Amino acid sequence: DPTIIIPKRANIPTNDLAARILRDVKVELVYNNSLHYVKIRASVVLDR
Amino acid sequence: DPTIIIPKRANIPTNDLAARILRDVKVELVYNNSLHYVKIRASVVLDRPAGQSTNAQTPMSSSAVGV
């Protein structure tokens, strides 16, 4: 599942507040991979 | 407090008794003054003022060295 995290006012350095900038927001994603190759393997064993 | 002073018969000149007039009654008062002008010194803080002094003693009202 995607996740999102935001910093609270108690962590923003006073330098940013003077410049009015919010940084360090983070997001997470996972990509859906396609298929490119397939390799079968088998063995015809006979009962005894 | 307002004061009122009245003289004494022994302190009145003989001339005034003939004229039948009293003098030298004195009164004092204090007036109360209204307000006409006012001044203000506002201030504005922009971001996170620095931490204040941690002193927790009663402020001494005078310097020890005066002699």
Tab-separated table of N, CA and C in Angstrom:
chain	number	residue	atom	x	y	z
A	1	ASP	N	0.832	-1.193	0.000
A	1	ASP	CA	0.000	0.000	0.000
A	1	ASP	C	0.874	1.252	0.000
A	2	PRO	N	0.540	2.260	-0.805
A	2	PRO	CA	1.288	3.520	-0.746
A	2	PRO	C	1.177	4.163	0.627
A	3	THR	N	2.238	4.854	1.031
A	3	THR	CA	2.287	5.552	2.303
A	3	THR	C	2.750	6.985	2.093
A	4	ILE	N	2.292	7.874	2.969
A	4	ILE	CA	2.638	9.290	2.909
A	4	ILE	C	2.921	9.769	4.325
A	5	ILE	N	4.003	10.525	4.492
A	5	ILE	CA	4.429	11.024	5.792
A	5	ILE	C	4.683	12.519	5.677
A	6	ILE	N	4.221	13.273	6.667
A	6	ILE	CA	4.337	14.727	6.651
A	6	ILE	C	4.979	15.180	7.958
A	7	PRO	N	5.897	16.147	7.935
A	7	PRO	CA	6.522	16.595	9.184
A	7	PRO	C	5.650	17.595	9.922
A	8	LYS	N	5.777	17.602	11.244
A	8	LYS	CA	4.992	18.496	12.075
A	8	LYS	C	5.760	19.787	12.349
A	9	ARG	N	5.025	20.801	12.809
A	9	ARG	CA	5.618	22.121	12.999
A	9	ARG	C	6.750	22.085	14.018
A	10	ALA	N	6.739	21.099	14.909
A	10	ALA	CA	7.766	20.986	15.933
A	10	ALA	C	9.080	20.428	15.399
A	11	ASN	N	9.196	20.218	14.089
A	11	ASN	CA	10.426	19.729	13.485
A	11	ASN	C	10.982	20.630	12.396
A	12	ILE	N	10.195	21.561	11.869
A	12	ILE	CA	10.661	22.453	10.813
A	12	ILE	C	11.660	23.434	11.419
A	13	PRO	N	12.893	23.510	10.919
A	13	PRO	CA	13.842	24.477	11.477
A	13	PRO	C	13.367	25.906	11.268
A	14	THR	N	13.760	26.784	12.191
A	14	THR	CA	13.340	28.178	12.104
A	14	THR	C	13.838	28.835	10.825
A	15	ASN	N	14.909	28.307	10.229
A	15	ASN	CA	15.393	28.867	8.973
A	15	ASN	C	14.347	28.751	7.877
A	16	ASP	N	13.656	27.615	7.804
A	16	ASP	CA	12.621	27.443	6.798
A	16	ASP	C	11.438	28.374	7.030
A	17	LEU	N	11.017	28.546	8.284
A	17	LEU	CA	9.888	29.426	8.560
A	17	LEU	C	10.152	30.842	8.071
A	18	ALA	N	11.396	31.312	8.172
A	18	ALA	CA	11.733	32.616	7.618
A	18	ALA	C	11.578	32.621	6.104
A	19	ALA	N	11.973	31.533	5.446
A	19	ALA	CA	11.851	31.424	3.997
A	19	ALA	C	10.524	30.825	3.556
A	20	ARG	N	9.699	30.351	4.487
A	20	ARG	CA	8.382	29.808	4.163
A	20	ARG	C	8.498	28.640	3.186
A	21	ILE	N	9.263	27.625	3.587
A	21	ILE	CA	9.509	26.438	2.777
A	21	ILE	C	9.205	25.205	3.609
A	22	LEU	N	8.520	24.241	3.001
A	22	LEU	CA	8.268	22.941	3.604
A	22	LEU	C	9.019	21.883	2.816
A	23	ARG	N	9.846	21.108	3.509
A	23	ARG	CA	10.702	20.114	2.884
A	23	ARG	C	10.555	18.788	3.617
A	24	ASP	N	11.134	17.746	3.028
A	24	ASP	CA	11.240	16.422	3.641
A	24	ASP	C	9.911	15.672	3.664
A	25	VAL	N	8.995	15.978	2.741
A	25	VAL	CA	7.821	15.132	2.569
A	25	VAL	C	8.230	13.886	1.795
A	26	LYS	N	7.654	12.745	2.159
A	26	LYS	CA	8.076	11.461	1.618
A	26	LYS	C	6.873	10.655	1.150
A	27	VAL	N	7.051	9.941	0.039
A	27	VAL	CA	6.001	9.120	-0.548
A	27	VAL	C	6.615	7.792	-0.968
A	28	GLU	N	5.782	6.755	-1.038
A	28	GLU	CA	6.239	5.410	-1.359
A	28	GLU	C	5.304	4.772	-2.377
A	29	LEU	N	5.894	4.073	-3.343
A	29	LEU	CA	5.135	3.411	-4.394
A	29	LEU	C	5.806	2.096	-4.754
A	30	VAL	N	5.030	1.207	-5.360
A	30	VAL	CA	5.525	-0.054	-5.896
A	30	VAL	C	5.005	-0.197	-7.316
A	31	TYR	N	5.883	-0.590	-8.230
A	31	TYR	CA	5.567	-0.652	-9.648
A	31	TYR	C	5.191	-2.071	-10.047
A	32	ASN	N	4.286	-2.186	-11.014
A	32	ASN	CA	3.802	-3.478	-11.497
A	32	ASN	C	4.685	-3.918	-12.659
A	33	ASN	N	5.402	-5.019	-12.462
A	33	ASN	CA	6.360	-5.478	-13.459
A	33	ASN	C	5.695	-6.413	-14.459
A	34	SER	N	6.044	-6.255	-15.734
A	34	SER	CA	5.520	-7.120	-16.775
A	34	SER	C	6.342	-8.407	-16.858
A	35	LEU	N	5.998	-9.240	-17.836
A	35	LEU	CA	6.675	-10.507	-18.068
A	35	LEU	C	7.408	-10.451	-19.403
A	36	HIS	N	8.631	-10.977	-19.430
A	36	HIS	CA	9.468	-10.937	-20.624
A	36	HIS	C	9.929	-12.302	-21.106
A	37	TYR	N	10.245	-13.226	-20.203
A	37	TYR	CA	10.772	-14.526	-20.592
A	37	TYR	C	10.070	-15.622	-19.806
A	38	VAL	N	10.089	-16.829	-20.372
A	38	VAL	CA	9.532	-18.010	-19.729
A	38	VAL	C	10.382	-19.209	-20.121
A	39	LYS	N	10.655	-20.083	-19.141
A	39	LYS	CA	11.569	-21.212	-19.338
A	39	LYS	C	10.984	-22.440	-18.640
A	40	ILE	N	10.461	-23.368	-19.444
A	40	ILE	CA	9.845	-24.564	-18.892
A	40	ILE	C	10.917	-25.595	-18.562
A	41	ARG	N	10.611	-26.454	-17.592
A	41	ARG	CA	11.463	-27.576	-17.231
A	41	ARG	C	10.577	-28.735	-16.809
A	42	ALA	N	10.875	-29.923	-17.326
A	42	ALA	CA	10.036	-31.083	-17.073
A	42	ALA	C	10.891	-32.337	-17.171
A	43	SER	N	10.310	-33.454	-16.740
A	43	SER	CA	11.018	-34.731	-16.739
A	43	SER	C	9.979	-35.842	-16.732
A	44	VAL	N	10.015	-36.701	-17.749
A	44	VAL	CA	9.034	-37.768	-17.893
A	44	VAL	C	9.513	-39.019	-17.172
A	45	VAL	N	9.245	-39.099	-15.869
A	45	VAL	CA	9.565	-40.303	-15.115
A	45	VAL	C	8.431	-41.306	-15.262
A	46	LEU	N	8.786	-42.588	-15.294
A	46	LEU	CA	7.819	-43.660	-15.465
A	46	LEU	C	7.710	-44.462	-14.179
A	47	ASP	N	6.500	-44.930	-13.892
A	47	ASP	CA	6.271	-45.727	-12.699
A	47	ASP	C	7.012	-47.058	-12.791
A	48	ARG	N	7.203	-47.683	-11.639
A	48	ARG	CA	7.816	-49.003	-11.578
A	48	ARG	C	7.091	-49.893	-10.577
B	1	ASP	N	-6.160	64.912	51.464
B	1	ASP	CA	-7.432	65.210	52.101
B	1	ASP	C	-7.593	66.721	52.258
B	2	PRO	N	-8.771	67.281	51.938
B	2	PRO	CA	-8.961	68.728	52.102
B	2	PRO	C	-8.798	69.180	53.543
B	3	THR	N	-8.188	70.344	53.742
B	3	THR	CA	-8.012	70.893	55.075
B	3	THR	C	-8.753	72.217	55.211
B	4	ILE	N	-9.250	72.476	56.416
B	4	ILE	CA	-9.964	73.709	56.730
B	4	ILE	C	-9.422	74.212	58.060
B	5	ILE	N	-8.955	75.458	58.086
B	5	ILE	CA	-8.398	76.074	59.284
B	5	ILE	C	-9.215	77.314	59.609
B	6	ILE	N	-9.639	77.429	60.862
B	6	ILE	CA	-10.437	78.565	61.316
B	6	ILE	C	-9.696	79.233	62.469
B	7	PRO	N	-9.651	80.566	62.533
B	7	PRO	CA	-8.910	81.221	63.620
B	7	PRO	C	-9.650	81.188	64.948
B	8	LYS	N	-9.091	81.846	65.958
B	8	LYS	CA	-9.681	81.921	67.285
B	8	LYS	C	-9.923	83.377	67.658
B	9	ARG	N	-10.908	83.598	68.530
B	9	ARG	CA	-11.260	84.965	68.905
B	9	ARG	C	-10.052	85.718	69.442
B	10	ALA	N	-9.201	85.042	70.215
B	10	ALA	CA	-8.007	85.682	70.747
B	10	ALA	C	-7.024	86.084	69.655
B	11	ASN	N	-7.170	85.549	68.445
B	11	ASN	CA	-6.253	85.816	67.349
B	11	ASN	C	-6.798	86.841	66.361
B	12	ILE	N	-7.914	87.482	66.670
B	12	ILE	CA	-8.556	88.450	65.782
B	12	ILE	C	-8.192	89.850	66.262
B	13	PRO	N	-7.687	90.728	65.396
B	13	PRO	CA	-7.350	92.084	65.846
B	13	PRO	C	-8.576	92.826	66.356
B	14	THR	N	-8.344	93.744	67.298
B	14	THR	CA	-9.441	94.516	67.866
B	14	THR	C	-10.200	95.279	66.788
B	15	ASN	N	-9.500	95.710	65.736
B	15	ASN	CA	-10.155	96.468	64.677
B	15	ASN	C	-11.236	95.650	63.982
B	16	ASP	N	-10.960	94.380	63.686
B	16	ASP	CA	-11.930	93.545	62.995
B	16	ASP	C	-13.189	93.311	63.813
B	17	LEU	N	-13.069	93.164	65.133
B	17	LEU	CA	-14.261	92.998	65.957
B	17	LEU	C	-15.178	94.207	65.851
B	18	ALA	N	-14.606	95.408	65.753
B	18	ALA	CA	-15.421	96.602	65.562
B	18	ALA	C	-16.151	96.555	64.226
B	19	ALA	N	-15.460	96.125	63.168
B	19	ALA	CA	-16.083	96.040	61.855
B	19	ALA	C	-16.966	94.809	61.708
B	20	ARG	N	-16.820	93.825	62.593
B	20	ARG	CA	-17.637	92.611	62.561
B	20	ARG	C	-17.389	91.810	61.288
B	21	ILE	N	-16.116	91.628	60.936
B	21	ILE	CA	-15.740	90.869	59.749
B	21	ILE	C	-14.647	89.878	60.122
B	22	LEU	N	-14.824	88.625	59.717
B	22	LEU	CA	-13.822	87.593	59.925
B	22	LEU	C	-12.930	87.475	58.697
B	23	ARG	N	-11.690	87.049	58.921
B	23	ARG	CA	-10.713	86.950	57.849
B	23	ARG	C	-9.810	85.748	58.087
B	24	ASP	N	-9.052	85.398	57.048
B	24	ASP	CA	-7.973	84.417	57.141
B	24	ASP	C	-8.495	82.992	57.295
B	25	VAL	N	-9.677	82.708	56.747
B	25	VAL	CA	-10.116	81.324	56.634
B	25	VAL	C	-9.453	80.702	55.415
B	26	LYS	N	-8.798	79.561	55.613
B	26	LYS	CA	-7.980	78.950	54.578
B	26	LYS	C	-8.482	77.550	54.269
B	27	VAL	N	-8.451	77.194	52.987
B	27	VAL	CA	-8.919	75.893	52.521
B	27	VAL	C	-7.938	75.384	51.472
B	28	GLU	N	-7.831	74.061	51.361
B	28	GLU	CA	-6.972	73.428	50.375
B	28	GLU	C	-7.733	72.316	49.670
B	29	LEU	N	-7.448	72.153	48.379
B	29	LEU	CA	-8.079	71.121	47.572
B	29	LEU	C	-7.080	70.624	46.538
B	30	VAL	N	-7.359	69.449	45.987
B	30	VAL	CA	-6.569	68.868	44.907
B	30	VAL	C	-7.498	68.592	43.735
B	31	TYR	N	-7.098	69.035	42.552
B	31	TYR	CA	-7.900	68.826	41.360
B	31	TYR	C	-7.556	67.490	40.711
B	32	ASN	N	-8.540	66.924	40.016
B	32	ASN	CA	-8.388	65.655	39.317
B	32	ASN	C	-8.343	65.922	37.821
B	33	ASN	N	-7.262	65.493	37.176
B	33	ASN	CA	-7.006	65.826	35.782
B	33	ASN	C	-7.464	64.697	34.869
B	34	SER	N	-8.193	65.058	33.815
B	34	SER	CA	-8.645	64.091	32.824
B	34	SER	C	-7.476	63.625	31.962
B	35	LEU	N	-7.737	62.706	31.038
B	35	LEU	CA	-6.721	62.157	30.151
B	35	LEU	C	-6.949	62.684	28.742
B	36	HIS	N	-5.884	63.174	28.112
B	36	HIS	CA	-5.976	63.765	26.782
B	36	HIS	C	-5.205	62.997	25.724
B	37	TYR	N	-3.999	62.528	26.032
B	37	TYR	CA	-3.141	61.889	25.047
B	37	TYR	C	-2.620	60.576	25.606
B	38	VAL	N	-2.368	59.628	24.702
B	38	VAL	CA	-1.877	58.308	25.065
B	38	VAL	C	-0.913	57.828	23.987
B	39	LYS	N	0.110	57.095	24.422
B	39	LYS	CA	1.112	56.547	23.519
B	39	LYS	C	1.253	55.055	23.775
B	40	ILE	N	1.576	54.321	22.712
B	40	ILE	CA	1.669	52.869	22.758
B	40	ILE	C	2.941	52.441	22.042
B	41	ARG	N	3.548	51.360	22.532
B	41	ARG	CA	4.740	50.776	21.924
B	41	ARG	C	4.470	49.288	21.678
B	42	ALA	N	3.861	48.990	20.536
B	42	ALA	CA	3.578	47.606	20.185
B	42	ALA	C	4.814	46.950	19.584
B	43	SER	N	4.799	45.621	19.542
B	43	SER	CA	5.901	44.866	18.970
B	43	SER	C	5.344	43.627	18.287
B	44	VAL	N	6.091	43.129	17.305
B	44	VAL	CA	5.682	41.971	16.523
B	44	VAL	C	6.847	40.997	16.440
B	45	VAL	N	6.546	39.723	16.657
B	45	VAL	CA	7.528	38.650	16.584
B	45	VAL	C	7.222	37.806	15.357
B	46	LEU	N	8.266	37.476	14.603
B	46	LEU	CA	8.119	36.781	13.332
B	46	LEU	C	8.232	35.268	13.439
B	47	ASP	N	9.191	34.742	14.200
B	47	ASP	CA	9.363	33.300	14.272
B	47	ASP	C	10.240	32.922	15.459
B	48	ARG	N	9.690	32.058	16.316
B	48	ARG	CA	10.436	31.369	17.365
B	48	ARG	C	11.399	32.292	18.098
B	49	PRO	N	10.907	33.183	18.956
B	49	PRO	CA	11.823	33.983	19.772
B	49	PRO	C	12.679	33.091	20.657
B	50	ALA	N	13.904	33.542	20.910
B	50	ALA	CA	14.857	32.731	21.655
B	50	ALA	C	14.379	32.510	23.086
B	51	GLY	N	14.800	31.388	23.665
B	51	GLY	CA	14.434	31.041	25.024
B	51	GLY	C	14.836	32.097	26.030
B	52	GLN	N	13.961	32.368	26.994
B	52	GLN	CA	14.203	33.424	27.960
B	52	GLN	C	15.098	32.926	29.093
B	53	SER	N	15.586	33.873	29.890
B	53	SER	CA	16.438	33.542	31.025
B	53	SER	C	15.677	32.681	32.022
B	54	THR	N	16.385	31.750	32.657
B	54	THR	CA	15.755	30.790	33.556
B	54	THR	C	15.812	31.241	35.009
B	55	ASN	N	16.263	32.469	35.255
B	55	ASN	CA	16.385	32.953	36.623
B	55	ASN	C	15.030	32.908	37.317
B	56	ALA	N	15.006	32.347	38.529
B	56	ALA	CA	13.764	32.159	39.273
B	56	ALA	C	13.843	32.749	40.675
B	57	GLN	N	14.679	33.757	40.881
B	57	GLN	CA	14.787	34.423	42.168
B	57	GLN	C	14.002	35.728	42.154
B	58	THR	N	13.676	36.208	43.346
B	58	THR	CA	13.032	37.507	43.462
B	58	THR	C	14.017	38.589	43.031
B	59	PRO	N	13.636	39.489	42.123
B	59	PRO	CA	14.600	40.474	41.613
B	59	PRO	C	14.999	41.467	42.695
B	60	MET	N	16.289	41.495	43.016
B	60	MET	CA	16.796	42.476	43.968
B	60	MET	C	16.532	43.877	43.438
B	61	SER	N	16.055	44.757	44.314
B	61	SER	CA	15.606	46.082	43.910
B	61	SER	C	16.701	47.140	43.970
B	62	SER	N	17.902	46.799	44.429
B	62	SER	CA	18.964	47.791	44.522
B	62	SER	C	20.313	47.088	44.525
B	63	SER	N	21.307	47.775	43.968
B	63	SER	CA	22.665	47.258	43.973
B	63	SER	C	23.270	47.378	45.367
B	64	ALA	N	24.013	46.345	45.764
B	64	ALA	CA	24.603	46.328	47.098
B	64	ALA	C	25.607	47.457	47.283
B	65	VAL	N	26.440	47.712	46.281
B	65	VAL	CA	27.500	48.704	46.399
B	65	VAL	C	26.915	50.092	46.181
B	66	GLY	N	26.923	50.906	47.231
B	66	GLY	CA	26.456	52.274	47.134
B	66	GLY	C	27.274	53.230	47.976
B	67	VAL	N	28.368	52.737	48.547
B	67	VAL	CA	29.224	53.548	49.402
B	67	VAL	C	30.676	53.367	48.984
